[PDB]
Amino acid sequence: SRMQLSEEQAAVLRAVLKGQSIFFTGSAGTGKSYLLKRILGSLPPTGTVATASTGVAACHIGGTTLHAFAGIGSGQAPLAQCVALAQRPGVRQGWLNCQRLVIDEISMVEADLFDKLEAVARAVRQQNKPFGGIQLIICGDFLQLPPVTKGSQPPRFCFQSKSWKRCVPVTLELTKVWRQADQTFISLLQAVRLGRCSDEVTRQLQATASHKVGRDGIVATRLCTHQDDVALTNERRLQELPGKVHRFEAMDSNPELASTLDAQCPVSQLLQLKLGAQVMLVKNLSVSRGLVNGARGVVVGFEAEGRGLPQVRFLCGVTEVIHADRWTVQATGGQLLSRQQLPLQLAWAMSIHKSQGMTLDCVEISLGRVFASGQAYVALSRARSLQGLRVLDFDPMAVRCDPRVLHFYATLRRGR
């Protein structure tokens, strides 16, 4: 075990191994990802179900989406219907065989959906205990973006559900800046997350507006709010370059489901590159050499023969030819599907949604406009340090947070 756990992280692990349902929570940069991986290595594979609310986060933990596991379609039908969908052959044994259920990215789950899931559990398993007697291991942070709904009315946070207190009797916090993160920058994030933008926070961010962050042909990625505008942007920037197009097609086990893999793993069926393309790594190839998720680079060549694989120069100081990697996704019903493709994305632009669970080493962020509660904090959390970041037109009016969620955190802090 490469690194020793902190006293706060050790407490979580203890509780989990005694069989207790627990929610653990804290800002970015407190070691939540490291702790999830240590929990999943410590538990028996048999009966342990790793899930996340998103595709992006599910892949980072080698699991599946909560939507796919559940098998209740959208969750919006009456209980008896949801319950009938969960009874379907493959979907049903997943519920029966689950002993411990890990759920990352809990901020994304709306309260009415948590309540539907909890009742579906008790019915399918014929067990009167909370969530059908499953040991729940829940990770996230409600000071992130609010949950989305389609349901016409306001969305409600997961902690407002009728079954939350019954299901989650112990909550523990991670508060210290983790040993793989920068003290100065995480301390600034922790102030922004609580809505608190002092004159010194505003100075430190405004001071980055003039920063040159790239070098050696690598330029900063512009962080954006919406995935579709991002794809058009990256495609237009690639079209402007004069080099010939190089195409890389995925090898899929089940090509009749490519759309599903496009939507759940971090790479597509077809990757196009040229000399000069701005790229981002999306697998951890080597932590010790800086080849981690979010590492920024530029294409500097292609192999002259064979498959013509790209040669990438990274900001971290590595130049290397990038080969195909593998991802496995679990479909509703349980079938394992696989995609082999290069672990690279275009990176003139990147959305907040597709960058969850990672940080970039070369990034530009615009924060003069007001966004939702938690938006300024979540965007700044995609950077690593003040050195790798340029903030345009920062305004402390950009910083808003949800007062109901602040009171939830203040109660937790008063405990200890």
Residue numbers in the entry: 203 to 618
What does the literature reporting this entry say, word for word?
Pif1 is a multifunctional helicase and DNA processing enzyme that has roles in genome stability. Pif1 proteins are monomeric enzymes and members of helicase superfamily 1 (SF1), while the 5′–3′ polarity of unwinding place them in the SF1B subgroup.
In the 1.44 Å apo-hPIF1 crystal structure residues after 620 are not seen in the electron density suggesting they are disordered. SUL1 is stabilized by hydrogen bonds with the main chain atoms of the loop residues from the Walker A motif and the side chain of the Walker A K234 residue at the beginning of the α2 helix, situated at the 1A–2A inter-domain contact area. Residue K414 was also selected for analysis and we also included the E307Q Walker B motif variant as a control. K414 is also in the vicinity of a bound sulphate (SUL3 in Figure 1B) and is conserved between mammalian and bacterial Pif1, but it is not in the ssDNA binding channel revealed in Bs and ScPif1 structures. However, a comparison of our 1.13 Å AMP-PNP structure with our 1.44 Å apo structure shows that the binding of the nucleotide induces movement of the Walker A motif (residues 228GSAGTGKS235).
